[PDB]
Specification:
Chain A: Keywords: Chromosome, Nucleus, Phosphoprotein. The structure is cut from a larger assembly and holds chains A (about 525 residues) and B (about 200 residues). Chain A is an alpha/beta fold and about 525 residues long. Chain A is about 20% helix and about 5% strand. The two termini of chain A are about 50 Å apart. Classes of the chains: A alpha/beta (about 525), B mainly alpha (about 200).
Chain lengths: ~525, ~200
């Protein structure tokens, strides 16, 4: 799923050095991105959406239940007229991407946080350089407005989601020559108000300066689409305890890269449950975070973990692997990882996995382990006392693995909270109704706005008409659509047309055809008694 | 003669009974060739059953081919053989669902009538050819109508003066004031041969 955000604002009317405006260059770049992505044999399941800088009823051009034909037709007729309302457009796009999330089961907020339930989405937000306006002045903060929150959105406290990356294109093409071609293989950043918003999600922001640089950035962007598993790392709290082959001193601490969870839907178990201590009676649930604040500690702690535990291959995208490569990729050794923010009743973090590398030393495998592996792996009334340290709802998925061996547990203590189940079906129904109402009025514009609003300065109610583009005057049916110049000739033409008594008469003077004239479409409505047997 | 009677007839019978359709395309050519080469005394008992069983096959290709290559057959086998059993073989090629065989039969009947003797020509025309003409004129397909309009304006001198006003004028006026222009272009481009 790819949602292209093209502003089509009035500031996108300035002409480049090639002769076309920035909007035409953006549309051409989108078309070349389409034809480049079509090369990879994986573009048979994705869906394209379009978002412009227009009113909430008119911002979306093609959303759910819209094929490629209507999407291309809407992107073709894009007009650059309006202000640069970036915040409202980003909010509308994020709400559109989060319409079918509370109904299928993604981010249920009650049963862990399953990383194998993915809904990838990439935003391009092709906008102008700077100087965004909000009908009052020029702002320099880019704060997303919060006026009408969706039902069930206060449990994340952030507009974007687990898998929602945000790339940006500014299209800073000069007007005279664009002769800046010193650095060949180098794509700098835009350094604008959208740069922090993009970096928070996990995607960079390109700075287009030349058509060659545009082609380079488009060819570099097609290689950044996969399953979205974005997790945040922190150096705390080990004081860079990497004393293995050298001495530490770094910027590879707050790594917020993605992870490629390739399927073999995705197959996996043992998710990151949450970051708080869930109580048995809690009417209000604390809001989750889109990026989990999980921290790693550099300790050997028996990296050899061999068992019949179901295996996972959530591949990690190499972005800050320099710190690992400095220590020879940690051969035959790993380092634990633990989620912060009160992972248990009374403690600060519980190691639930590690980041052991592969034998090929190519990337990090991201070995996800159970909540507390070094205890259950090595019954004398031990498991009954051990199952009290883990979160309650967490007994859900692990028991499935126990199904591979037997079934000692039951549904006696399989209860998260009596108040968490309530006020959940109503929120899901409200979200479904909102998604249906949004998908219903998605393409039907029905503007019907043509007036001059004649002010005084039949009274207080007059309004002069405006020039209608698609008027289609009926010359043979309506007599008012016949001007004075070609009146007598048109009169004789109408007379001859009425006195001819032909078959299948029409009221159009000369209606040649539409913009498209297909050969197969016209040849299908015919009959040819021939087969060419010879 | 002996070489084609002894060993070529079995080969031809085995090739005519093939389960493929593309072989009949050339089997009918071999048949018309051996019919034109051989004399009269060795047709009514050797080549007739093969062409009869091939002209009524499940496929329409062999039927189209025998409809095309029919003038040579009717001119080589003689008039009597065409009087005995060629009438049903020619009639079954005008009442099919495919328009190709009907158009071919319409195109060929003009010169098929040219090589017909004057002993049973008018009888078979007013008794058998006339119903087929009347049922093919009112067809909905445009190709067969255009073929008829282009081919039927050659049988006027054969029927005579007192036979045009009988049935030729109604069908001519019907094909003239038709809905599609394809049949009108053919019925109006061959109106000089009916002036004499």
């Amino acid at each position: 799923i790819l949602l292209f955000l093209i502003d089509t604002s009035a500031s996108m009317n300035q002409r480049s050095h090639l002769g076309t405006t920035y909007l035409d260059t953006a549309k051409g770049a989108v078309e070349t991105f389409m034809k480049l992505r079509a090369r990879d044999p994986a573009s048979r399941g994705d869906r394209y959406m379009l978002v412009t800088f227009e009113e909430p009823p008119y911002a979306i051009k093609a959303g759910w239940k819209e094929n490629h034909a209507t999407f291309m037709n809407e992107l073709k007729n894009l007009q650059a007229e309006g202000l640069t309302t970036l915040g409202q457009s980003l909010r509308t796009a994020f709400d559109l991407l989060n319409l079918n999330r509370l109904v299928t089961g993604i981010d249920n907020y009650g049963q862990g946080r399953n990383p194998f339930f993915l809904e990838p989405a990439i935003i391009i937000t092709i906008t102008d350089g700077s100087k965004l306006t909000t009908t009052s002045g020029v702002q320099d903060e880019l704060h997303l407005p919060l006026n009408s929150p969706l039902p069930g959105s206060e449990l994340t406290k952030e507009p974007f989601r687990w898998d929602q990356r945000l790339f940006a294109l500014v299209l800073r093409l000069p007007g005279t020559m664009s002769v800046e071609s010193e650095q060949l293989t180098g794509v700098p950043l835009d350094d604008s108000a959208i740069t922090p918003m993009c970096e928070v999600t996990g995607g960079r922001s390109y700075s287009v300066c030349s058509p060659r640089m545009l082609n380079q950035c488009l060819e570099s962007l097609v290689q950044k689409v996969q399953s979205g598993v974005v997790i945040n790392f922190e150096k705390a709290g080990p004081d860079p305890s990497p004393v293995e082959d050298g001495q530490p001193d770094g910027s590879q601490p707050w790594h917020s890269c993605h992870k490629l969870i390739y399927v073999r839907v995705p197959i996996g178990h043992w998710p990151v449950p949450e970051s708080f201590w869930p109580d048995q009676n809690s009417p209000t649930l604390p809001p989750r975070t889109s990026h989990p604040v999980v921290k790693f500690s550099c300790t050997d702690c028996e990296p050899m973990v061999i068992d019949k535990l179901p295996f996972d291959k959530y591949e990690l995208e190499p972005s800050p692997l320099t710190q690992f490569i400095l220590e020879r990729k940690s051969p035959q050794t790993c380092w634990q990882v633990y989620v912060s923010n009160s992972a248990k009743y009374s403690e600060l973090g519980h190691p639930f996995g590690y980041l052991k590398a592969s034998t090929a030393l190519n990337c990090v495998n991201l070995f996800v382990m159970p909540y507390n592996y070094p205890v259950l792996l090595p019954w004398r009334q031990s498991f009954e006392s051990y199952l009290k340290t883990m979160p309650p709802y967490y007994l859900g998925p692990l028991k499935k693995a126990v199904r591979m061996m037997g079934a000692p547990n039951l549904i006696a203590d399989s209860m998260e909270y009596g108040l968490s189940y309530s006020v959940i079906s109503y929120l899901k129904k409200l979200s479904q109704q909102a998604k249906i109402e949004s998908d219903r009025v998605i393409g039907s514009v029905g503007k019907k706005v043509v007036q001059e609003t004649g002010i005084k300065v039949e009274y207080t109610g007059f309004q002069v008409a405006l020039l209608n583009k698609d008027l289609k005057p009926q010359t043979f049916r309506n007599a008012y659509d016949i001007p004075r110049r070609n009146l007598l000739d048109h009169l004789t033409r109408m007379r001859s047309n009425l006195l001819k008594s032909t078959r299948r008469f029409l009221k159009g003077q000369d209606e040649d055809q539409v913009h498209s004239v297909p050969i197969a479409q016209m040849g299908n409505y015919q009959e040819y008694l021939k087969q060419v047997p010879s | 003669l002996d070489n084609v009677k002894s060993e070529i007839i079995p080969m031809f019978s085995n090739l005519a009974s093939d389960e493929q359709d593309s072989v009949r395309l050339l089997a009918v050519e071999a048949c018309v060739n051996i019919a034109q080469l051989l004399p009269q005394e060795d047709l009514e008992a050797l080549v007739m059953p093969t062409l009869r069983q091939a002209a009524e096959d499940k496929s329409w290709r062999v039927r189209y081919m025998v409809a095309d290559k029919f003038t040579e057959l009717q001119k080589a086998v003689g008039p009597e053989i065409t009087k005995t059993d060629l009438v049903p073989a020619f009639q079954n090629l005008m009442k099919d669902c495919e328009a190709e065989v009907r158009a071919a039969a319409s195109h060929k009947v003009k010169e098929f009538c040219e090589n017909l003797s004057a002993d049973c020509r008018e009888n078979v025309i007013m008794s058998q050819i006339l119903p087929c003409i009347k049922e093919l004129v009112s067809d909905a397909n445009q190709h067969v109508k255009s073929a008829l309009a282009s081919v039927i304006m050659g049988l006027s001198p054969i029927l005579g003066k007192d036979n045009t006003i009988e049935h030729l004028l109604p069908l001519f006026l019907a094909q003239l004031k038709d809905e599609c222009p394809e049949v009108r272009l053919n019925i109006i481009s061959n109106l000089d041969c009916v002036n004499e």
